[PDB]
Design a protein around this ligand. Structure first.
Ligand SMILES: Nc1ncnc2c1ncn2[C@@H]1O[C@H](COP(=O)(O)OP(=O)(O)O)[C@@H](O)[C@H]1O
Ligand SMILES: Nc1ncnc2c1ncn2[C@@H]1O[C@H](COP(=O)(O)OP(=O)(O)O)[C@@H](O)[C@H]1O
Lengths: 239, 239
């Protein structure tokens, strides 16, 4: 049962963090316009996002973004649990610790120039254990904290200060590189990606379905197009 | 800051040693028509050149010649320091010492026939540590002194005499052969060399720019043209 699950669907808006809901959905969770949504992944982790209310763009579909796909290990064709958090929390102390994995070629203070004139009039909520990208320096670096104030109680506020230690921590292989090519990196092909989406996720996302049924699974797929259309890119993304 | 640097630009005049300036440039350095310009390279070396004043040929660009490119280890896309030297010095004693590296096939006295009827009405200034070429004998030989009067105080005057010792000095590998093919050895191709000039000096003259930006650098360049147009010559020069 549990009439509150939302199936993951493809996103069409190239925005940062906006989730579209339906008119009946506000009355079920008594959620306001701008609230803090709490999501449960696996391995005891949580994620925070920003919900948007609209009755013109979407009808009964969610718009789940890649910024939280790797933060919950949730892919296409998976269920998730939604729960409002109307509690008011204002962060005042945060911890920052860069990892010695992608700091090559970067010198000086980068926080005071990339994080200060970007978070104003945004009020973006953050949580311990989130991987977010920034647009600066003709590239995109990541961030990950390992020890900070107990979650949540993390709100970007001007009262926070900066600090440095000089002792980086060693990264682990538990998580994957979010910088790799995804489903948001292919554009201009709606009808062509749809066929791949409706033939690849059956024998891969649900392998157990095919040992029990006698239906012939597709074994070989041929790609066409002039050189450079992105045949390799699509194959890299769908895998 | 330092509003006195001059960016190295391509030269169009096939002259020997002439530098073109602008009208405001004379009033900043209070330099006369014919003066002795002092240039600072690296590894504690100096160079001397002759400046020309003109307000019709160039507007705000320098014409830096290859005769002083190898004497200061300065290439395209580099900064230099300019400084006038209004001091009057007249040389009366110079030292000459040929190196046993390119004297093969040359017999007899070559100075009295190549240097005497060439420096009259020229007043070309010279300095200890300069590599200059001469036009004589269907070739071009070089010269380099290792011990002479303290720099500068070197002016070509008729009062100087000649001398010989017979003990050549061994050359070193610190400097390169100026006789190799350069940017002044290709003519008749203005638009074609411009594209190479605006695609090769980014990832070579400034390698550190590309480890920090995500811009795709050009990896392969294809050359065209009938046999003998100089495809090898251009590649040899740009490297
Ligand atoms: N539709 C597309 N969307 C985004 N990038 C594309 C697209 N088509 C081609 N590219 C770019 O082309 C690059 C290489 O082309 P690719 O598709 O990998 O080779 P091929 O076209 O032979 O499969 C990719 O890195 C990608 O950035
Ligand atoms: N534009 C040019 N300027 C000066 N020399 C040239 C030019 N084009 C051809 N040459 C002469 O042709 C010689 C050999 O031609 P090269 O270009 O090296 O062979 P290819 O044309 O097969 O690359 C060069 O050493 C050079 O003297």
């Amino acid at each position: 049962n549990r009439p509150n699950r939302l199936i993951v669907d493809e996103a069409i808006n190239e925005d940062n963090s906006v989730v579209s809901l339906s008119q009946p959905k506000m009355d079920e969770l008594q959620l306001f316009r701008g609230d803090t949504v709490l999501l449960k992944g696996k391995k005891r982790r949580e994620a925070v996002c920003i919900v948007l209310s609209d009755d013109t763009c979407s009808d009964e579909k969610i718009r789940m973004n890649r910024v939280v796909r790797n933060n919950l290990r949730v892919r296409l064709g998976d269920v998730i649990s939604i729960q409002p958090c109307p509690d008011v929390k204002y962060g005042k102390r945060i911890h920052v610790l860069p990892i010695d994995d992608t700091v090559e070629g970067i010198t000086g203070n980068l926080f005071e120039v990339y994080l200060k004139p970007y978070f104003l009039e945004a009020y973006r909520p953050i949580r311990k254990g989130d991987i977010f990208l920034v647009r600066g320096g003709m590239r995109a670096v990541e961030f990950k904290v390992v020890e900070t104030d107990p979650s949540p109680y993390c709100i970007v506020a001007p009262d926070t200060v900066i600090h440095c230690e000089g002792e980086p921590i060693k990264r682990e292989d538990e998580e994957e590189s979010l910088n790799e090519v995804g489903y948001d990196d292919i554009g201009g092909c709606r009808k062509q990606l749809a066929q791949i989406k409706e033939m690849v996720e059956l024998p891969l996302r649900h392998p157990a379905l095919f040992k029990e049924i006698g239906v012939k699974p597709p074994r070989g797929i041929l790609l066409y197009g002039p050189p450079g259309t992105g045949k390799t890119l699509i194959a890299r993304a769908v895998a």
